[PDB]
Design a protein around this ligand. Structure first.
Ligand SMILES: *CCC(=O)N1CC(NC(=O)COc2ccc(Br)cc2NC(=O)c2cc(C)no2)C1
Ligand SMILES: Nc1nc2c(ncn2[C@@H]2O[C@H](COP(=O)(O)OP(=O)(O)O)[C@@H](O)[C@H]2O)c(=O)[nH]1
Ligand SMILES: [Ca+2]
Ligand SMILES: [Ca+2]
Length: 169
């Protein structure tokens, strides 16, 4: 049969988690998506000549401890660490999100991809080298994306699946 993978999209409020997910699933850019909606989206995709069924959890919620969330996040097999290139705080939050994933996954070498979203914008505060060096230290891929133009959207999610398939076998 077909291999299924649970992907979890994480990152600071307003970085473009829902925008990136909705572009992948429904092929359009949402400008004002309700920031409390946390839903799972399904999509069959072919990656490197092999089909996979993606189950994509678009996370939201509050900045708080939650054993209920932890249980949800435990099931995730790969994580998109999303920041916005015009928001230095969202880039700083990446470290915290990685540490939380490590905690809930018993410090597993968890498949992850660093995503620098909103690359279409000219108001860049986070430099590419800084993001590259961070992803280098983590030992994960770095993908620049724009949910608006759809630049790098497929690549980001596809790359995460590649990381999962490297990790599992
Ligand atoms: C605009 C709303 C939105 O998109 N967001 C607010 C913020 N939500 C969260 O950060 C939810 O919390 C998490 C989600 C995903 C992960 Br991998 C980790 C967390 N945070 C924690 O697990 C945690 C534990 C403790 C002690 N504090 O935080 C995104
Ligand atoms: N210019 C630009 N704006 C974006 C992009 N992705 C999301 N946004 C905008 O940033 C805001 C937050 O997007 P949203 O997907 O709700 O972020 P979330 O809170 O992480 O789900 C919205 O007004 C979006 O229109 C992008 O790639 N480029
Ligand atoms: Ca959202
Ligand atoms: Ca609460």
């Amino acid at each position: 049969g077909m291999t299924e993978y649970k992907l979890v999209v994480v990152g600071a409020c307003g970085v473009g988690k829902s925008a990136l997910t909705i572009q992948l699933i429904q092929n359009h850019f949402v400008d004002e998506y309700d920031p409390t909606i946390e839903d799972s989206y399904r999509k069959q995709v072919v990656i490197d000549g092999e089909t996979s069924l993606l189950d994509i959890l678009d996370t939201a919620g509050q900045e708080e401890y939650s054993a209920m969330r932890d249980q949800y996040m435990r099931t995730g097999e790969g994580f998109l660490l999303v920041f916005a290139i015009n928001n230095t705080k969202s880039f700083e939050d990446i470290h915290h999100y990685r540490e939380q994933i490590k905690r809930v996954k018993d410090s597993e070498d968890v498949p992850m991809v660093l995503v620098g979203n909103k690359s279409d914008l000219p108001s860049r505060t986070v430099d590419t080298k800084q993001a590259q060096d961070l992803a280098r230290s983590y030992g994960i891929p770095f993908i620049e994306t724009s949910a608006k133009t759809r630049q790098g959207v497929d690549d980001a999610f596809y790359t995460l699946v590649r990381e999962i398939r490297k990790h599992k076998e």
